[PDB]
Curated annotation (Swiss-Prot):
Keywords: ATP-binding, Folate biosynthesis, Kinase, Nucleotide-binding, Transferase. Monomer. The lineage of its organism: Bacteria, Pseudomonadati, Pseudomonadota, Gammaproteobacteria, Enterobacterales. Catalyzes the transfer of pyrophosphate from adenosine triphosphate (ATP) to 6-hydroxymethyl-7,8-dihydropterin, an enzymatic step in folate biosynthesis pathway. Pathway: Cofactor biosynthesis; tetrahydrofolate biosynthesis; 2-amino-4-hydroxy-6-hydroxymethyl-7,8-dihydropteridine diphosphate from 7,8-dihydroneopterin triphosphate: step 4/4. One of its GO terms (biological process) is folic acid biosynthetic process. Its EC number is 2.7.6.3. Gene3D superfamilies: 7,8-Dihydro-6-hydroxymethylpterin-pyrophosphokinase HPPK (3.30.70.560). InterPro entries: Hppk, Hppk_sf. Disulfide bonds: none annotated. PANTHER family: 2-AMINO-4-HYDROXY-6-HYDROXYMETHYLDIHYDROPTERIDINE PYROPHOSPHOKINASE. This is 2-amino-4-hydroxy-6-hydroxymethyldihydropteridine pyrophosphokinase. It comes from Escherichia coli (strain K12). Belongs to the HPPK family.
């Protein structure tokens, strides 16, 4: 199945963090990278007392179960010094979010796929569209059409 993973970083040299994350994603068992986006510099969604993010997206072919993929993406975050602060939307060295896991709909305590907020976030959708312009969501909506409807600002390269 093709998993689409969003990458964000706004601490500890985001470019280095993102390059390290891409290497580590390729090292996940039973999986391989298919496509990587460009790197974008985006202003924080939430609290404004934090740096700009580097955002990107990757397509990862995998035969792991979704929770097993999540175990690995969380391991990569931890090995890159991710610390969850108290505040919501606060800064982090690395955030790996599973946007889509094929055409699956997953609703569990640990894992909600499609990612619950991605359709509201240009920093998620634009890198995704770069790597998967024909994508159709589980609910039948075209990615291309969502971008048009919402008319989110285009992103700047890192
Ligand atoms: N699609 C998904 N991808 C990654 N984690 C997910 C997820 N759906 C649910 N989660 C859960 O989200 C929990 C918190 O992860 P965090 O990375 O701290 C949220 P965040 O990415 O900072 O905010 P965001 O989800 O608004 O982007 C994880 O422990 C995981 O169980
Ligand atoms: N610009 C930007 N802001 C963000 N703000 C919050 C979160 C998050 O809570 O995971 N992620 C991002 C992100 O990746 N990019
Ligand atoms: Cl605010
Ligand atoms: Cl949802
Ligand atoms: Cl959907
Ligand atoms: Mg996130
Ligand atoms: Mg996350």
């Amino acid at each position: 199945t093709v998993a689409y993973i969003a990458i964000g970083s706004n601490l500890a040299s985001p470019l280095e963090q993102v390059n390290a994350a891409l290497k580590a994603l390729g090292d996940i068992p039973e999986s391989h990278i298919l496509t990587v986006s460009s790197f974008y510099r985006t202003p924080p969604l939430g609290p404004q007392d934090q740096p700009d993010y580097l955002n990107a997206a990757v397509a990862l072919e995998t035969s792991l179960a979704p929770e097993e993929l999540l175990n690995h993406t969380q391991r990569i975050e931890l090995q890159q010094g991710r610390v969850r602060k108290a505040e919501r939307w606060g800064p982090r060295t690395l955030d790996l979010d599973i946007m889509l896991f094929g055409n699956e709909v997953i609703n569990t305590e640990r894992l909600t796929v499609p990612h619950y907020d991605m359709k509201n976030r240009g920093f998620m959708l634009w890198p995704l569209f770069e790597i998967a312009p024909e994508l159709v969501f589980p609910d039948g909506e075209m990615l291309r059409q969502i971008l048009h409807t919402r008319a989110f600002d285009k992103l700047n390269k890192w």
